[PDB]
């Protein structure tokens, strides 16, 4: 990235906003981050598209729970070599905590981590 350069996916304000929203644990800051991300010129194909429905708006307290949807996300493979044990271990435990599935990535894993502490 360079100020004289063109657009980019990960800018500076974006990353600072995301990190502060995660640390502070405040959904309003994450909404601000999402607005700051969506309000840029088109960069990818999916941006050219736009949603459209003909139904009626429904109250948000009738759709699936948060966990029923979180059970769908995963984290792709990350190698134990190109990462530090700390980061991959933290990612693994954080994904196993809420029920979603993490990955292993090429490069095996420590067998000593087969049973919980």
């Amino acid at each position: 990235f360079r100020k004289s350069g063109d657009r980019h996916g990960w800018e500076g304000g974006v990353i600072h906003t995301l990190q502060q929203a995660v640390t502070n644990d405040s959904y309003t800051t994450f909404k601000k981050y999402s607005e700051q991300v969506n309000k840029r010129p088109p960069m990818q194909l999916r941006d050219l598209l736009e949603l459209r429905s003909t139904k009626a708006p429904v109250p948000v307290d009738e759709v699936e729970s948060i966990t029923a949807i979180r059970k769908r996300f995963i984290t792709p493979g990350m190698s134990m070599g190109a990462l530090s044990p700390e980061a991959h271990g933290t990612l693994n435990v954080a994904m196993n905590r809420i029920g979603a599935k993490s990955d292993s990535g090429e490069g095996g894993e420590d067998p000593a981590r087969f049973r919980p502490d």
Partner: protein
């Protein structure tokens, strides 16, 4: 000594068995509610009271359903979201690991998180 209570209850049971035997019937499930087997007598020819227990001796003819508990097992109650909670928290019962869940509640969810 507990044997005292043992023999007490056994003697009471034998007495009621003999009483129902002499009465004529065969089991207790047929005399419950047949309140026409009772009659009122007087205390004596000296008190001259007019006690009438008739406001009890009447009863209502049931019909189809019997006069006792014909339904074994308790009457279950409708379950709240916590049941679905149990279905999600299997690792907490099978391996013992932490869990973090979240839901949208309403004022029609009584006594949440009790079965857990």
């Amino acid at each position: 000594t507990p044997e005292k209570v043992v023999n007490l209850f056994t003697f009471l049971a034998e007495e009621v068995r003999e009483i129902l035997a002499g009465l004529g019937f065969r089991s207790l499930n047929e005399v419950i509610g047949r309140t026409d087997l009772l009659h009122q007598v007087s205390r004596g020819a000296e008190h001259l009271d007019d006690l009438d227990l008739n406001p009890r001796l009447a009863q209502v003819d049931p019909g189809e359903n019997a006069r006792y508990c014909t339904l074994q097992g308790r009457n279950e109650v409708p379950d709240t979201l916590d049941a679905r909670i149990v279905a999600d928290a299997r690792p907490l019962f099978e391996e013992g690991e932490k869990m973090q869940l979240a839901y949208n509640a309403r004022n029609t969810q009584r006594a949440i998180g009790t079965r857990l």
